[PDB]
A paper describes a structure:
SEL1L, the mammalian homolog of Hrd3p, associates with HRD1, mediates HRD1 interactions with the ER luminal lectin OS9, and recognizes substrates to be degraded. SEL1L is required for ER homeostasis, which is essential for protein translation, pancreatic function, and cellular and organismal survival. Previous biochemical studies reveal that SEL1L is a type I transmembrane protein and has a large luminal domain comprising sets of repeated Sel1-like (SLR) motifs. The SLR motif is a structural motif that closely resembles the tetratricopeptide-repeat (TPR) motif, which is a protein-protein interaction module.
We found that the central domain of SEL1L, comprising SLR motifs 5 through 9 (SEL1Lcent), forms a tight dimer with two-fold symmetry due to domain swapping of the SLR motif 9. Crystals of SEL1Lcent grew in space group P21 with four copies of SEL1Lcent (a total of 82 kDa) in the asymmetric unit. The assignment of residues during model building was aided by the selenium atom positions, and the structure was refined with native data to 2.6 Å resolution with Rwork/Rfree values of 20.7/27.7%. The two SEL1Lcent molecules dimerize in a head-to-tail manner through a two-fold symmetry interface resulting in a cosmos-like shaped structure. Each protomer is composed of ten α-helices, which form the five SLRs, resulting in an elongated curved structure, confirming the primary structure prediction. However, the last helix, 9B, at the C-terminus adopts a different conformation, lying parallel to the long axis of helix 9A instead of forming an antiparallel SLR. Helix 9B from one protomer inserts into the empty space surrounded by the concave region in the other monomer, forming a domain-swapped conformation. In this interface, Leu 516 and Tyr 519 on helix 9B are located in the center, making hydrophobic interactions with Trp 478 on helix 8B, Val 444 on helix 7B, Phe 411 on helix 6B, and Leu 380 on helix 5B from the SEL1Lcent counterpart (Interface 1 detail). For this structural geometry, two adjacent residues, Gly 512 and Gly 513, in SEL1L confer flexibility at this position by adopting main-chain dihedral angles that are disallowed for non-glycine residues. Notably, a single-residue mutation (L521A in interface 3) abolished the dimerization of SEL1Lcent.
Numbering used by the authors:
A (entry chain B): 353 to 524
B (entry chain A): 352 to 524
Write the structure that this text describes.
């Protein structure tokens, strides 16, 4: 079991992008056998992102949107990354741009754009995108109020994004 | 007021809403948010929705038929009927159903080629179980020659909850 973690660090060192992102995330939270390190997380994420991995880009965007002493907070490079991610089209990126257009974070407030981004994320099962979309329907922000739309997306979010999510969690 | 929503769903299912029939069916199948475990109402909702063309309803039926109960008397041949209807429509649960069927010759002749290809189709869709089956086959060289790295890829996917982003979703379920 320890060998599997070291094997992964080995494959990541040799350019396995999947391994870089996976490990990046485990250091970001502390994991299977992995001790938590934001340093190692940011470094892995830069590796995979420079290789073009959309998930890595989005993780960076997050770390810049919510800055620590290792990654100092900056909404401008968080935007840079959410936009690279979203172009490809990663739901986390789509959500990020969504928030930016909803609240004018580094961009002019634009409710249609927000709406379309949250919808794109929401379709891909991204619970947050669904929550955001639900709020906009509930509060009639991007659109005219539809409590039932809100109900649909809130329901999806509560199921974990998809009716089958339970079963994936049932084995995790 | 959650009860009012459960009743609102009962209302929508009763008026032909396929999603609501399937959703409530699932809640009755396991026992859930405000809902009592009831295999009978589960089976009725699943039949209602399957007749309407819903792949999830079909797959659920396939499941309670491969795995018999007192309500649903076991028949892996109709379990196969439904897994095949679901799989025809891209449903990962169905695809996985055929996969098991071919892996272990349940109501069908053993065929590792088919098991492997059905598990691939389901795994592609983030379905943790299909990823596990596929991983097992590569790891123990069942359908093909042992491919430790393939095995590893799918085990990793499974361990992440089917997708690297899955943890973030499943944390809010």
């Amino acid at each position: 079991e320890e060998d599997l973690i070291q094997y992964y660090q080995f494959l990541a060192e040799k350019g396995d992008v999947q391994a870089q992102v996976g490990l990046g995330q485990l250091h970001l939270h502390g994991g299977r056998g992995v001790e938590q390190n934001h340093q190692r997380a940011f470094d892995y994420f830069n590796l995979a992102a420079n290789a073009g991995n959309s998930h890595a880009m989005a993780f960076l965007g997050k770390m810049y949107s919510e800055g620590s002493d290792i990654v100092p907070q900056s909404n401008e490079t968080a935007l840079h990354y959410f936009k690279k991610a979203a172009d490809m089209g990663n739901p986390v990126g789509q959500s990020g741009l969504g928030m930016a257009y909803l609240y004018g974070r580094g961009v002019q407030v634009n409710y249609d754009l927000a709406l379309k981004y949250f919808q794109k994320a929401a379709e891909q099962g991204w619970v947050d995108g669904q929550l955001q979309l639900g709020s906009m329907y509930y509060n009639g922000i991007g659109v005219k109020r539809d409590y039932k739309q809100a109900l649909k997306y809130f329901n999806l979010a509560s199921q974990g994004g998809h009716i089958l999510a339970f079963y994936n969690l049932a084995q995790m």
